[PDB]
Amino acid sequence: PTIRLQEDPDPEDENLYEKNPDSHGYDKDPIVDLWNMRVVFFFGFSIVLVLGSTFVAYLPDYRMQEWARREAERLVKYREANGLPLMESNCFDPNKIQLPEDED
Amino acid sequence: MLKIIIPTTMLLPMTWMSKHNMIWINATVHSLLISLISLSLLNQLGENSLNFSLTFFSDSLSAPLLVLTTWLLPLMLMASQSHLSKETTTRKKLYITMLILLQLFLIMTFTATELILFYILFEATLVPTLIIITRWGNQTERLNAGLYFLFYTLAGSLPLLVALVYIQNTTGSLNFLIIHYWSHPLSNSWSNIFMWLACIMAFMVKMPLYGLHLWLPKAHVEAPIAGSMVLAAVLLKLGGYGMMRITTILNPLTNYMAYPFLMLSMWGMIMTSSICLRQTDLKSLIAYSSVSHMALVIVAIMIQTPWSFMGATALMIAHGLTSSMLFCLANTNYERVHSRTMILARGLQTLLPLMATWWLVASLTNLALPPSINLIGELFIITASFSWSNITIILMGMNMMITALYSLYMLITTQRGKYTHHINNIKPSFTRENALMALHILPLLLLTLNPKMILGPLY
Amino acid sequence: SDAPPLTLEAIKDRVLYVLKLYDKIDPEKLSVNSHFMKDLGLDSLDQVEIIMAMEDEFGFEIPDIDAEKLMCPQEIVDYIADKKDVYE
Amino acid sequence: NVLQIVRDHWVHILVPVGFVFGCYLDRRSDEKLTAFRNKSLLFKRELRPNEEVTWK
Amino acid sequence: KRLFIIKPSGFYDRRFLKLMRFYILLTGIPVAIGITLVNVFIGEAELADIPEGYVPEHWEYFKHPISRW
Amino acid sequence: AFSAPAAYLTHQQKVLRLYKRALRHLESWCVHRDKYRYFACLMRARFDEHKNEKDMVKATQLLRQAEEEFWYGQHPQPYIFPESPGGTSYERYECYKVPEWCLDDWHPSEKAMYPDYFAKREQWKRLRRESWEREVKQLQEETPPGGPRTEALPPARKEGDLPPLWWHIVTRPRERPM
């Protein structure tokens, strides 16, 4: 036969615009395609995007940024008035630390 | 966090019980709802992590990754339904099943409290990806691409398993909280050096580190579009997440074991950026872009500073979004002209203006235009490297110039010039493709508006 | 606005004007179908000079392969009209 | 007529039901880790005249 | 004269743009109106000291009504 | 740009091209018109001095010498017409050129405007569809057995034939499309 095998020919690609000039590119069935467009748009842009962005914008301050700012204001006020240094090099009281006896 | 895991497991029978013509609609709607639910994980604390149970916990590093995974599922669904139209119903359901299983494994991987469970899930992510690539790829190179993807990964991951069981026999636990609180320094001995290498090489090959990246162009070019999306956006970030987790027990040995990987990352960053300048395949260019950005992420993780960790987190999220968008943009042209060669279809801005705008925005985020989170991450990493050593700016500086060059080269080659005369089958952009590009790009700028949500636990 | 919509009559008028400002061509003996070699007795160099004069008049160059072929004012006018998309 | 509508769109309750079941199971899991409720040095508190537990 | 100008089909891009605008506005105009109404008619809380013997609720530690909710 | 090229140029063709190039570059050097006319007449006299050389070898040697002199003495920044391949407006309007097949994909609402234009378009398309096979067969007949040797195409000869391969030459976008 001068052939090697029985095979279907490679078919041409279908244009969704031919049977549906406003086809939205979701499906060949116009009704299913239209509703796929609608659900994608509503649940992506209207619900997740805008409402999720609002939710994230108004999340309560569990990172304690404002609490830390107010605590630092109290500490600075107290230390400035008393004449104490604003900050201490050692964050742990040396009285609770026991260095090794001998360094030689 | 079963309120997120269980709905995906329910996505499975929902897909397998749907009518033959509603599978895409149902999967997309419920995937988007699951993403909305996962959005609640962004409410993180400042001191410790959210410890849901003995098995699952959520940190400020894994919450954006989970949100990215759950958001990426619907986009993959929209991107896949075009070229799967002629497929039978059972095979379409199997494709959706593969995607759902991949999402479930990824969701469980980012929240596992133990390292062995994390290993099991991070290795279970292989089977759906390999099946997707080798079954629904287009060309005959997909088989070799699957083999390369499998064995490069496993040859790195098995020594990690040995090291993990050894560590559990030594310290008595692999729970991450116990590991962090009861951390002890690593001495300088050959046993400790090889333990370091066993704990690091699997994540290095996942990034992938330069010289160990040959699997990535094959796998990311030969895969279908959803495979490429999830391979570039999420699966590469497993290496970075695992490396930031595991480096807790590797100090102070890292102080000098990081040198070869740092040199490889910087020089291979330069090399992969240069490779992007002479590339005839449009998808391979995007793959090598991913390699360069991940080399930057490797450097940031290796130098071990708070600024470098913040930059690494931001860069991983930004790169996931940008690279997924670029892959989808290339797939649109491929579906139009059935060829990946970059200089075949030219002057496309004349024929498709809105798609040209999407191309411009994607390539602008690729080159890290301020104040995008791409640039926030890149600049944090560059500052951390400069503090590490003032001479890194030269290598970092060269990379910035090269990245801009190849990004705009891609843009000008594909969109500008004159349209090829013989190609007359370039139909107008569908609503689906435009919605896909918009859903890629709008979250990027929205995250730019509030950047502390992607800056990690060191913030 | 911009320059007017150039027409075939204007093109022919300008071509004949330039040709009648040429000292080696007699005005009345010149016609719109006059050949440069046969009827007017010009050599190749004169044809090259005429082509350059046409280029100056219309503000655009003509490729040498195309330029060599034109032999009568009709061919020059036709080439100019086809180049500038003139149909009326 | 709702028979066909239900048999065509009953797959739309699986995911919300999974969500509420996951919420319930998370509450149940939280119920098993109360060994230190109202016992930490930072949050130890005297009970109100009416309440029984500080958190659920 | 007036000639025909050959262009690619601008119908589908315009349709997508107006659909995206419609849905985004559809959900984002009510949200903006609600935020404005809440801010005008339910202001932010005023920082005050904890009265003796009172144990505030966990949401009583934030100032914005939407964050508190 | 419109004529099919030949396998090679002839000696007189090369001389004419060099003459045009030299005149243009001399005009670039001589900005003013009277000076240009003076030196152009001098150049023409110099060109036609050796016009009557029957030894082709010495003619080509003189042509070689003249080309070398031109390359040494050319203007580094010669005048270019704005739409010539090096001009400031060379490909300025290429971005406004849209192929005619793009009209096949317009939405029916877009085609609702301009009904008569699209009726004429349908007539043109029917004409092309009817003439294609006759064009192909005429090309088949007129082509030598060993394939074509030049890029020149035959015209129409029969009753209502059309010159083969005409659609993309006739339906060019425009020179000022938008």
Ligand SMILES: CCCCCCCCCCCCCCCCCC(=O)OC[C@H](COP(=O)([O-])OCC(O)COP(=O)([O-])OC[C@@H](COC(=O)CCCCCCCCCCCCCCCCC)OC(=O)CCCCCCCCCCCCCCCCC)OC(=O)CCCCCCCCCCCCCCCCC
């Ligand atoms: C088109 C789409 C196409 C595609 C594009 C892509 C779109 C993607 C969208 C995705 C979703 C995004 C959603 C984002 C969620 C974020 C919402 C949020 O957090 O709101 C934040 C923020 C609300 O802050 P807040 O924390 O909630 O309130 C805290 C206080 O308690 C409040 O203080 P208060 O007690 O004073 O109350 C103030 C109250 C009341 O204020 C007033 O009444 C006073 C105002 C002054 C009036 C005084 C004179 C006028 C009257 C005088 C005459 C009448 C009286 C006398 C009558 C006789 C006449 C003589 O006003 C408000 O409540 C705030 C306005 C509500 C805005 C909420 C935004 C929600 C957006 C979600 C929808 C997203 C889609 C967009 C669609 C939205 C619709 C287009 O809203 C703002 O954006 C404020 C911005 C205005 C500040 C001024 C601008 C300063 C400029 C500086 C930069 C200069 C450089 C140049 C750059 C200029 C560029 C602008």
Ligand SMILES: CCCCCCCCCCCCCCCCC[C@@H](O)O[C@H](CO[C@H](O)CCCCCCCCCCCCCCC)COP(=O)(O)OCC[N+](C)(C)C
């Ligand atoms: C097509 C035409 C386009 C042009 C026309 C557009 C017309 C104008 C509209 C453009 C808006 C201009 C932007 C200007 C900024 C104003 C909004 C800003 O003020 O809000 C920010 C708030 O923005 C949000 O916080 C960021 C949005 C969150 C982004 C998350 C994306 C949603 C999930 C989607 C999928 C996720 C994928 C990625 C995985 C990680 C402020 O943050 P914050 O300083 O606090 O507020 C202080 C007061 N609070 C705290 C009480 C609220």
Ligand SMILES: CCCCCCCCCCCCCCCCC[C@@H](O)O[C@H](CO[C@H](O)CCCCCCCCCCCCCCC)COP(=O)(O)OCC[N+](C)(C)C
């Ligand atoms: C293609 C990309 C692949 C990925 C790249 C992976 C990178 C792996 C590189 C490993 C980094 C360092 C490994 C070992 C640490 C030091 C290396 C050694 O050369 O340093 C000296 C070691 O001295 C000598 O070099 C001895 C080692 C000589 C034998 C090693 C073979 C190296 C040959 C190169 C083979 C290529 C290896 C990679 C295969 C692909 C230090 O002196 P010393 O203080 O005494 O040893 C320190 C350990 N102590 C403290 C316990 C004693």
Ligand SMILES: CCCCCCCCCCCC(=O)SCCNC(=O)CCNC(=O)[C@H](O)C(C)(C)COP(=O)(O)O
């Ligand atoms: C600004 C600086 C640039 C200037 C530098 C240039 C200097 C070049 C000047 C000297 C070069 C010459 O003249 S070299 C002269 C070469 N001589 C011959 O070729 C003899 C045979 N004649 C023919 O072949 C044709 O008759 C022909 C003469 C071509 C006319 O063609 P028509 O009659 O059939 O139109």
